[PDB]
Amino acid sequence: AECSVDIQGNDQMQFNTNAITVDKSCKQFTVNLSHPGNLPKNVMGHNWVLSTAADMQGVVTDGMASGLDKDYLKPDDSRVIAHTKLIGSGEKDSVTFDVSKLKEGEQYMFFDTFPGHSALEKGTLTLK
Ligand SMILES: [Cu+2]
Ligand SMILES: [Cu+2]
């Protein structure tokens, strides 16, 4: 089964899916994020961050408070299962993570932590 997915971060602030399914068959999984538009990361940055559904809000909140300079992530946030860099327009980033970190039966959220983006740029990831 495929073990990769193309996700995109927008001016318009939208993701092309609000749902990812990672085949249980996969040992690693990669997300390729990319950014349509013309604006710099300091103004319209996008990342893709993965955590447990429970943790999502804390990760978003602590990341907003850590600044641009930490890519909108609290440093050493152990709730983050995986994440890309914070990217701006014309920039791409990929993250590959161990599928051993995902427990079948858990609910995962992916989201962007640039201030305010996670209200639209959010989605479900499930292991199947
Ligand atoms: Cu496969
Ligand atoms: Cu964004």
From Swiss-Prot:
Domain Plastocyanin-like as annotated: residue spans: 1-128
Coiled coil (residue ranges): none
Molecular function via GO: copper ion binding; electron transfer activity; identical protein binding; transition metal ion binding; zinc ion binding
Disulfide bonds: C3-C26
Gene Ontology CC terms: periplasmic space; plasma membrane
InterPro entries: Azurin, BlueCu_1, BlueCu_1_BS, Cu-binding_ET, Cupredoxin
Protein name, entry field: Azurin
Organism field: Pseudomonas aeruginosa (strain ATCC 15692 / DSM 22644 / CIP 104116 / JCM 14847 / LMG 12228 / 1C / PRS 101 / PAO1)
